């Protein structure tokens, strides 16, 4: 019995889920209640763009509303979150605080962990990144051979790549005189070699991502890295000029050969998928400027005040979160569908990928027990429109419920045949939710059928397949325009979103010991995988792999 | 009842499943059977590389493998095969065949659609394939002012996009002399505009992929790209010199203003999920060579005859499937993940996504009736290594049970530093299935540690955190290396996957009605976004949002 299942509110929720499930039916509930909308929305206005959050087609009701948000109080999710906004140490079996709200302090208002004000050194690394940044777009920094820097690499993977990467792929349209950027992560050689092939070494900027400065993916890249630049250039002094890193770790740095004036820092209470603000965004800030970098941590701060100040039933992560906490402790789904209107946020629904499912799939509360009820969901998506012709017809027509957020900004970058393109997105946007949530009768269908011309016989055999059951919930988040701010604002309030997630089901939103197991296990494996002797010493699935591979290797095809 | 739950087998299954899960440990089944690894694998040899299917760390015994090829049996999987080999029209709400094998059919064994062999048209449609590739690739098709062919332009969505993109990221090694491929298909203007300014339309050909050649998002970037293309050359008849067509529909293709002559054609029987085997795929030709297109068919071709001729306890897809079924079916997995370990292979979770889910996202059995048990598992997954870092925080200590495919080449397209960026992928790769299987013991965490010198204190608060339950089952697909020919037969390997739990689910994996209903309420939509009046025609959501677009599309951000 962990603490959510122990939680009355929580019982009362389940309670009501058993006696009134049937009574959930949203056509129904949109036909009963012609001002929904009204009473299951958010407007929010930043001053830089409006937010829209429509979770109107959701199953709920004002009562479920109600229990949702005392289950909040009840899981004390607003004394939580006073304590991560005060540095306190939050992440309990690491010791530390959880401060990415401080990265983006636009306030200053002091923030302190161990009696001691963050803010200082937090602004002294803005200040080093804004001045390389500075040196480097307007041409000051000059490579080996004397030329300016024309594309800047980030080696990292994971935190220390997918936020980057993410924002930098979001924001292209404001990188104007911004050299071009590359995200090398992945070990497999494929990654490092066909990114190198495409540079000068001359006009290349490395940038070695890494909290620890030991993950053997970064550290390898940044050595084979290193090497073609060497084979090029051939003077260690040169490395001065084209590899920088970011990191918490000064001796690894400095032992991997980089200058210490080189070494942009960041600090043990920045989780890495929540460090894009921090240091690891450098290369954001490289690509898009430090201003519009400045914008982006500007647009976290504002949804961090309205986390922070909003009441619990208007408050917009705290929603998103109880809903999530309906549909996955109530009705099951397993997972939730993150499904961008936008090609620019091409890479939106990988990023939280990593940010909801690496902070809350977890099975061990704070008292230390292990939970008897699901934790986070399995996250997912593609861009709309695209997703309509591939994976809709399953969430239409399948045998899962799959909550899904759509996510639209109702200006284009790209305003083209005088915003025809933006339109038709436009339509399939509020056309996939109504028909998620509205189906399409036996009766319906068959009306169809029959104005079609259609045999009795033709229509019977087709009928059923025409129908939708409906009945498919959706949040609708829209947005006046995808700039800097919003974007950063976007971001924020899924991240609190996930936190209060994380308070509800009484785990650790912020260590990730998950991934320990496989790299002991990785370490043990790669001697074992030079020569040709077979290998016998694990179970018998691991040797058969390996032994396949080193006759395969062989293998002349 | 769905003929799946009335069947006997899948009712021993199920009773199975009910009185022997508890035993179901894969540490357990591991040590008492030495031979597990030769039992339960299959490894089969192309002739052009080797694949090795182990499916042993699965949660499965001799008896629940020899209940699930029963199960085959008595759902009809080789007569259903059969008839799809054979031409009939088991597509059976649309009244068509199905014949994505009669297009890599490299054997011309007669494969006949209401008496007419359709070889001769598959093949002469690939004669022309290969001449134009010839004549795009030597030089020998010039522009409108006499320069040749730098870069092919694809314009599609879905089926008619995600397969030759997917094709093309995996094959890029095999594209030295080809011109550059770009792929455009969202509606969202970002798409076609961001790739627009990078080309220049004397050295540009569009090819215009479509099925039906009227899908919105297409025809529209078609206009759009067509557009962009006559300011500069202001000639109509340069058009036949730069805008090809696939499609089925030389009608509209008249129409749009692509000469007859410039429409490489496919048929009805070629569903678009399963089409980049046809016309559909000059792109895939256009870039790595038609040599190399044909050995993507016939790699194809035999995974078609393993497919058609192996009995099915040793028949890759058949087994695939059936672990499926199992893990959807008695255990109730919603998701199955796949993990390929090569960079190349990045979009290749997201192709079958939609293969997958496109297909089998369905709950109209052939008698017309609801099934009342789980089809379609929702598909997923983000190459290796860079999900350990990532989700795999989730598949190690979250809630949820979640099948996982693990895919890798023995043999790396880029062996830099003397092969040892690959030796550590596939450590990493070995290792992490280990250890979902194996997990670690709060005894064997303890002892760890006790071993790093922790306090009491200190140890007892972070021990339960360190504990892997494990008993997490994976497939571990590896092969020789990823040519053409090994590519193609891995397609087909989970095409034919698909297919037989289609078959088993008594569904049609070829129809795909759920896209219809959005199709319709957003032709409902486009016309009531343009203008500034108030919208109430629709639900009060629906409503909500068209004027919240309205008010802020004239905002100044
Ligand atoms: O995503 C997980 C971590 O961010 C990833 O393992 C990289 O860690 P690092 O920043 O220490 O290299
Ligand atoms: O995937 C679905 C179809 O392939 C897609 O809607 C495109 O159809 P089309 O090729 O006729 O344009």
Same mark, same amino acid.
Request: glycine share 6%; with cysteine.
């Given at each position: 019995?962990?603490?959510?299942?122990?939680?009355?509110?929580?019982?009362?929720?389940?309670?009501?889920?058993?006696?009134?499930?049937?009574?959930?039916?949203?056509?129904?509930?949109?036909?009963?209640?012609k001002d929904r909308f009204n009473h299951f929305s958010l407007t929010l206005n930043t001053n830089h763009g409006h937010i829209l959050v429509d979770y109107s087609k959701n199953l709920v009701t004002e009562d479920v509303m109600r229990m949702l948000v005392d289950l909040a109080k009840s899981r004390g999710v607003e004394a939580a979150r006073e304590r991560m906004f005060n540095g306190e140490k939050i992440n309990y079996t690491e010791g530390r605080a959880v401060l990415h709200v401080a990265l983006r302090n636009r306030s200053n208002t002091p923030i302190?962990?161990?009696?001691?004000?963050?803010?200082?050194?937090?602004?002294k690394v803005l200040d080093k990144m804004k001045s390389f940044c500075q040196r480097v777009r307007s041409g000051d920094w000059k490579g080996?051979?004397?030329?300016?820097?024309?594309?800047?690499?980030?080696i990292g993977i994971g935190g220390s790549d997918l936020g980057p990467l993410m924002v930098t792929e979001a924001l292209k349209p404001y990188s104007s005189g911004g050299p071009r950027v590359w995200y090398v992560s992945n070990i497999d050689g494929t990654h490092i070699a066909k990114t190198l092939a495409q540079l000068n070494p001359?006009?290349?900027?490395?940038?070695?991502?890494?909290?620890?400065?030991?993950?053997?993916?970064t550290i390898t890249n940044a050595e084979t890295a290193?090497?073609?630049?060497?084979?090029?250039?051939?003077?260690?002094?040169?490395?001065?000029?084209?590899?920088?890193?970011?990191?918490?770790?000064?001796?690894?740095?400095? %032992?991997? =050969?980089?200058?210490? *004036?080189?070494? !942009?820092?960041?600090?043990?209470?920045? +989780?890495?998928?929540?460090?894009?603000?921090?240091?690891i965004g450098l290369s954001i800030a490289l690509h898009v400027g430090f201003d519009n970098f400045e914008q982006l941590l500007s647009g976290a701060h504002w949804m961090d005040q309205h986390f922070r100040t909003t009441p619990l039933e208007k408050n917009a992560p705290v929603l998103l979160a109880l809903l999530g906490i309906w549909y996955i402790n109530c009705f099951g789904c397993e997972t939730h569908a993150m499904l961008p209107y936008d090609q620019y946020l091409h890479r939106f629904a990988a990023y939280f990928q990593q940010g909801d499912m690496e902070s809350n799939g977890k099975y061990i509360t704070k008292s230390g027990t292990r939970v008897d009820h699901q934790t986070?969901?399995?996250?997912?998506? %593609?861009? =709309?429109?695209?997703? *309509?012709?591939? !994976?809709?017809?399953?969430?239409?027509? +399948?045998?899962?419920?799959?909550?899904?957020?759509?996510?639209?900004?109702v200006q284009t970058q790209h305003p083209i045949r005088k915003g025809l393109h933006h339109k038709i997105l436009l339509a399939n946007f509020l056309a996939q939710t109504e028909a998620l949530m509205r189906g399409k009768s036996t009766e319906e269908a068959r009306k169809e059928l029959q104005a079609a011309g259609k045999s009795p016989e033709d229509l019977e055999r087709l009928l059923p397949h025409k129908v939708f059951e409906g009945n498919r919930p959706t949040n609708s988040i829209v947005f006046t325009k995808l700039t800097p701010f919003m974007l950063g604002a976007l971001v924020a309030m899924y991240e609190h979103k996930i936190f209060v997630q994380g308070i509800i089901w009484d785990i650790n939103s912020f260590d990730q010991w998950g991934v320990e197991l496989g790299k002991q296990l990785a370490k043990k494996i790669e001697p074992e995988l030079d020569g040709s002797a077979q290998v016998t010493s694990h179970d018998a699935s691991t040797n058969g792999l390996i032994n396949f591979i080193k006759q395969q290797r062989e293998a002349r095809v």
């Open positions: 019995m962990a603490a959510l299942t122990r939680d009355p509110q929580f019982q009362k929720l389940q309670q009501w889920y058993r006696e009134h499930r049937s009574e959930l039916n949203l056509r129904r509930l949109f036909d009963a209640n302190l962990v161990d009696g001691k004000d963050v803010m200082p050194e937090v602004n080996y051979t004397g030329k300016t820097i024309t594309d800047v690499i980030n001359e006009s290349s900027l490395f940038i070695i991502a890494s909290k620890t400065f030991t993950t053997q993916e290193k090497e073609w630049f060497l084979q090029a250039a051939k003077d260690p002094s040169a490395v001065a000029k084209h590899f920088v890193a970011l990191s918490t770790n000064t001796t690894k740095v400095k %032992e991997f =050969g980089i200058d210490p *004036q080189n070494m !942009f820092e960041f600090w043990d209470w920045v +989780g890495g998928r929540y460090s894009l603000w921090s240091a986070g969901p399995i996250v997912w998506g %593609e861009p =709309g429109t695209n997703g *309509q012709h591939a !994976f809709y017809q399953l969430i239409h027509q +399948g045998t899962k419920m799959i909550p899904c957020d759509f996510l639209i900004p």
